Design a protein around this ligand. Structure first.
Ligand SMILES: *[C@@H]1O[C@H](CO[C@@H]2O[C@@H](C)[C@@H](O)[C@@H](O)[C@@H]2O)[C@@H](O[C@@H]2O[C@H](CO)[C@@H](O[C@@H]3O[C@H](CO)[C@@H](O)[C@H](O)[C@@H]3O)[C@H](O)[C@H]2NC(C)=O)[C@H](O)[C@H]1NC(C)=O
Length: 115
């Protein structure tokens, strides 16, 4: 979900450059199961920018697979609920596919499922 917005962070090139400096590298994982609203896509990209900066300063990639797994299993599900529930969602929202970056307008969830 981190390759669709804020391209000036150059996450792809930064991952490649950190990996030119050692244990194997995995970029990038498949997030095709997810689709996020604009706000959540910015948030997860900014968070990944900050995480990658910490790794760059100390030249350490060993925790990257765990970060991707945490996104897949824990954080991206949280952002998905944020995007579809109040107070963020009213009526409908556009979710952007994490693999293709293409958007689809969908309805918000009912308060029953949200809370
Ligand atoms: C994000 O988008 C990917 C890309 O697939 C898209 O498919 C159409 C919606 C097009 O409009 C394109 O924009 C794009 O290529 C979605 O991945 C795809 O998921 C479908 C599962 O729904 C897979 O389609 C299949 O159809 C036949 C079965 O009839 C077989 O290929 C499979 O059994 C499967 O059902 C398709 O293979 C898959 N594509 C890839 C490359 O994974 C993805 O679902 C979507 N994610 C979200 C969250 O919306």
């Amino acid at each position: 979900c981190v390759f669709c917005r804020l391209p000036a962070h150059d996450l792809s090139g930064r991952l490649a450059r950190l990996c030119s400096q050692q244990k194997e590298c995995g970029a990038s994982p498949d997030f095709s199961a997810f689709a996020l609203d604009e706000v959540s896509m910015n948030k997860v990209t900014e968070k990944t920018h900050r995480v990658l900066r910490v790794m760059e300063i100390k030249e350490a990639v060993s925790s990257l697979p765990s970060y991707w797994s945490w996104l897949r299993k824990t954080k991206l599900p949280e952002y998905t609920r944020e995007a579809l529930c109040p107070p963020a969602c009213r009526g409908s929202t556009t979710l952007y596919n994490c693999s293709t970056c293409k958007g689809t307008e969908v309805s918000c969830w009912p308060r029953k499922r949200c809370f």
